[PDB]
Structure 1
Amino acid sequence: KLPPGPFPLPIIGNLFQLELKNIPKSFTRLAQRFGPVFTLYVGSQRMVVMHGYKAVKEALLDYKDEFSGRGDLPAFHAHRDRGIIFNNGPTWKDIRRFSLTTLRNYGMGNESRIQREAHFLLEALRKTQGQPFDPTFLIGCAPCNVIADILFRKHFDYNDEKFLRLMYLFNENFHLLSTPWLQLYNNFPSFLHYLPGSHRKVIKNVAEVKEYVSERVKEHHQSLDPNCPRDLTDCLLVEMEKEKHSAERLYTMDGITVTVADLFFAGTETTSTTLRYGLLILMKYPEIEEKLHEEIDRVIGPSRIPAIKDRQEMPYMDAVVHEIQRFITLVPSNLPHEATRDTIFRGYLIPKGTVVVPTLDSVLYDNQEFPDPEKFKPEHFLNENGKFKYSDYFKPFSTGKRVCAGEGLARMELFLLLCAILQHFNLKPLVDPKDIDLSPIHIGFGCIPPRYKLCVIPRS
């Protein structure tokens, strides 16, 4: 017996119960008709959605091994069953475990890297000279580089036409992946794939970044010395040669290229966007900026670069960084899991290959944990005491076996960089803080911020 749900129409399915502009809201809406676990057929594809902290945790922490799979995402057939994110293969487990180990070994190291990078952000920011600018392609360079150094020991100038091109692709794709047409293409790929439409643009872009990353991996291989692995890409290559004789294969050149692409855009566009929501948020609530400045000055001074150990000393900063991520629910629907082996969830049988959706926004907007969850309120992570307060509901990276791999670097990237930009700059909205609308402009894959420009006016 499957989890409850709407009666599915022929072919179409339960797509009338779905608003493509905004799926998560549809989930929320269905959650209140059928409770915490429900069944949806979209296309022929049959999915199970969990809504709310109890249901989502159970899914992600209790049935780790059962909901191990990764639902398919047709935009990314280019990536499927390879790398990590889109790997629903027998390949998945080890190439993840290895990169995760490697990301660890490059991270103790990570602090310095972000710190080094910050230098350039500030430089690029002063250069705007208190004028209006679109930050999308200023602030995004920082995560990009940080990852570029881990990935290819490569550094970019904030004006390399290729660099900017890669960022544009990441933005174009995130943008596009959160719009209706791709939501539908996501679930009816065979019907739509050869019809015209922006699904074609996404594919073209996925292919462009894969090609580029591909070339870099070949460059690496052609020059690889296995004693001196220069970066991540290297560490992978040496595993690829370590077993050229092994009959059955784990690392193929493609395999690596996908793995690398995965962290490349992953490390870049998630943190860039989050940072950009942060900045916009902070311009809505100038009094929070002011409070934050006070702390930076009190605890770090107007000079010394922010460090990880200052976080324990700064609870307003901390909480802000948290609420930023909680409020904006970047991956509001989580990334799609698949049921691996025939499974019993609460009452219900969940067949094999079922797309399991453990919805994050439903966790992040608990109106018990976070009273007025719809409001941006640092207090959500503060206790009446003024110190930091941790929430078990803070899971915008998810949890369990597919927990975001770049979490540590994400977390650090946000706090440090944000810290930096505020330490040296005040934020200027070009519209009244009263007229700033924080609502995403698209909701699918991700939650996407209004385009906006701003001024940064120095503090030294």
Structure 2
Amino acid sequence: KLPPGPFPLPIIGNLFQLELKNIPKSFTRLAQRFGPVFTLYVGSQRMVVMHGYKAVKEALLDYKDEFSGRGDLPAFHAHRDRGIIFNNGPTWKDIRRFSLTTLRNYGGKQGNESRIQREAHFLLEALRKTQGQPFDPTFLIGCAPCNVIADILFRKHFDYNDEKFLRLMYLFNENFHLLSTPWLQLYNNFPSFLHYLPGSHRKVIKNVAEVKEYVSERVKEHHQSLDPNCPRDLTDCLLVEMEKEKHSAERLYTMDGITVTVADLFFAGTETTSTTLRYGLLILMKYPEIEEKLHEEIDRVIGPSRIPAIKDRQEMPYMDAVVHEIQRFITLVPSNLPHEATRDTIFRGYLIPKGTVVVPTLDSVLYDNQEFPDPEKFKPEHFLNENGKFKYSDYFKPFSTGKRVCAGEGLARMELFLLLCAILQHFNLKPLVDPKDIDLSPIHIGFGCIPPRYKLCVIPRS
């Protein structure tokens, strides 16, 4: 007994029920019609969508092992079943677990804060270097989290002007962008009919292969000078783990597997944080009054010169709330990443067969209209008690939750606080249009929500 849903058509299933430019909106439309759990056929493939905190929470937390699979994403077939993001195989569990331990060992530790704090040095330099002229913040702000993850992964630090640096960011940006477009949405559910026609899916595929090749080469480089006594980074810690298991019959790690793990952490480690920061700057420019309040709190708690520290969050409730509100407001990965039933499952009273794609929607949660009155409006007080202290919400789920929760959550959240603190400590944001004319709406919705392209100026405070 499948969850209720619209009557599918031959070949295309439910494609008339879906607006490809705005799948999250189609999902919301379908939840009004059929309730919090529903069935869809997108092409021949069956999915069940959960919509709203209760349904999304049950799916991700009560049936953790049942939905701990990962739905196929054809554009990233080069990663499928290797690493962590795109694998629905036996190898997922211990590669994930090991990566998380290594990530954590590399930073509570204060290695993460320090690492972020020292990148803020280079980020702040680049912004001063624009000397108050208009600039596209895309490939400037983006260097910050990209270097931070490069330190952990490769022991590698890049100049902001360096050629392969800018190119890797370009490809990350292009992929996140194109994956959020309607042609790619159609491609991921009809890959066999469409794969060999021309179109943007081919750019994504080429792009994925280029990043993988760049990673691959850094990995083999790491092999050729690996000191098993003295691992330099996460890429090393994975090499060490592969060669402890030389004699083993069953292999957890391959050289292909590790490059995928690294290519994963490199892409995810860079793109979502950069997009978040970039969106956050555009929002703060739409509400001059919010930036002002931020400036006074930074001047009061930290002052004009002392490098922001994580221990400042407790004492900066307005900043803390704004940072949460940026992530809640932009719903950056608004349908989550797709899950799948590892087993024939009984959810509520419905059968969800093995290998049904399961979509525990995140925007439906982050935009709950009772948890967050006026959820469509940007409001720091969505995360502030009436007496002005930071207010926690169980609805703040932008990193998802459960078995497949974002592997970089700790890092990302630290980065957003400390980098946004740093930027506002030293700079005023200057929009090139009137704050009233700024349209905050995503220009593409799919895999992510993509901000409009814009230029701005930053005007030094110190």
TM range (shorter): over 0.9
Query: What is aligned with 1:298?
Result: 300
How far, CA to CA, are the matches of 2:255 and 2:39 in structure 1? 39
How far, CA to CA, are the matches of 1:386 and 1:56 in structure 2? 30
Match of 2:40, SS? strand
Deviation per residue, 1:35-72 (Å, 9 max, x gap): 00000000110000000000000000000000010000
How far, CA to CA, are the matches of 2:123 and 2:90 in structure 1? 40
Deviation of residue 285 (structure 1)? 0.2
Match of 1:138, SS? helix
Deviation per residue, 1:284-311 (Å, 9 max, x gap): 0000000000000000000000000000
Deviation per residue, 1:157-185 (Å, 9 max, x gap): 00111000000000111110000000000
Deviation of residue 5 (structure 1)? 0.1
How far, CA to CA, are the matches of 1:213 and 1:43 in structure 2? 34
1:262 pairs with one of 253, 264, 276: 264
How far, CA to CA, are the matches of 2:25 and 2:192 in structure 1? 26
Deviation of residue 32 (structure 1)? 0.4
Deviation of residue 279 (structure 1)? 0.2
Query: What is aligned with 2:89?
Result: 89
How far, CA to CA, are the matches of 1:17 and 1:344 in structure 2? 25
How far, CA to CA, are the matches of 2:268 and 2:223 in structure 1? 23
Q: Does 1:46 align with 2:60?
A: no
How far, CA to CA, are the matches of 2:185 and 2:219 in structure 1? 32
Match of 1:428, SS? strand
How far, CA to CA, are the matches of 1:6 and 1:74 in structure 2? 25
Match of 2:335, SS? coil
How far, CA to CA, are the matches of 2:155 and 2:64 in structure 1? 34
Match of 1:401, SS? coil
Match of 1:96, SS? helix
Query: What is aligned with 2:17?
Result: 17
Deviation of residue 436 (structure 1)? 0.1
Deviation of residue 265 (structure 1)? 0.7
How far, CA to CA, are the matches of 1:393 and 1:360 in structure 2? 9
How far, CA to CA, are the matches of 1:243 and 1:179 in structure 2? 42
Give 1:35-184 correspondences, 5 Å limit: 35-106=35-106, 108-184=110-186
How far, CA to CA, are the matches of 1:23 and 1:230 in structure 2? 43
- Count of residue pairs the alignment pairs up: 459
Deviation per residue, 1:242-283 (Å, 9 max, x gap): 001100110000000000000001000010000000000000
How far, CA to CA, are the matches of 1:372 and 1:227 in structure 2? 56
Instruction: Name the TM-score, length of structure 1 as normaliser.
Output: 1.00
How far, CA to CA, are the matches of 1:372 and 1:72 in structure 2? 35
How far, CA to CA, are the matches of 2:68 and 2:293 in structure 1? 43
Deviation of residue 87 (structure 1)? 1.0
How far, CA to CA, are the matches of 2:358 and 2:177 in structure 1? 24
Match of 1:400, SS? coil
Deviation of residue 380 (structure 1)? 0.2
Deviation per residue, 1:105-163 (Å, 9 max, x gap): 00x40000000000000100000000000000000000000000000000000011100
Query: What is aligned with 1:199?
Result: 201
Deviation of residue 337 (structure 1)? 0.3
- Identity across the alignment (%): 100
Deviation of residue 223 (structure 1)? 0.6
Deviation of residue 401 (structure 1)? 0.3
Match of 2:403, SS? helix
Match of 2:224, SS? helix
Deviation of residue 312 (structure 1)? 0.4
Deviation per residue, 1:339-378 (Å, 9 max, x gap): 0011000010000000000000000000000000000000
How far, CA to CA, are the matches of 2:213 and 2:147 in structure 1? 19
Deviation of residue 395 (structure 1)? 0.3
Structure 1 segments, 4+ long, off by >2 Å, are none
Query: What is aligned with 1:234?
Result: 236
Q: Which runs of 5+ in 1 are unaligned?
A: none
How far, CA to CA, are the matches of 1:448 and 1:407 in structure 2? 20
Query: What is aligned with 1:408?
Result: 410
Instruction: Name the TM-score, length of structure 2 as normaliser.
Output: 0.99
Deviation of residue 449 (structure 1)? 0.1
Match of 1:335, SS? coil
How far, CA to CA, are the matches of 2:405 and 2:343 in structure 1? 20
Deviation of residue 211 (structure 1)? 0.4
How far, CA to CA, are the matches of 1:285 and 1:164 in structure 2? 30
Match of 2:141, SS? coil
Match of 1:41, SS? strand
How far, CA to CA, are the matches of 1:294 and 1:448 in structure 2? 30
Deviation of residue 414 (structure 1)? 0.3
How far, CA to CA, are the matches of 2:228 and 2:49 in structure 1? 45
Match of 1:325, SS? helix
Match of 1:7, SS? coil
Deviation per residue, 1:13-39 (Å, 9 max, x gap): 001000000000000000000000000
How far, CA to CA, are the matches of 2:293 and 2:416 in structure 1? 18
Match of 2:412, SS? helix
Deviation of residue 324 (structure 1)? 0.1
Q: Which runs of 5+ in 2 are unaligned?
A: none
How far, CA to CA, are the matches of 1:449 and 1:428 in structure 2? 17
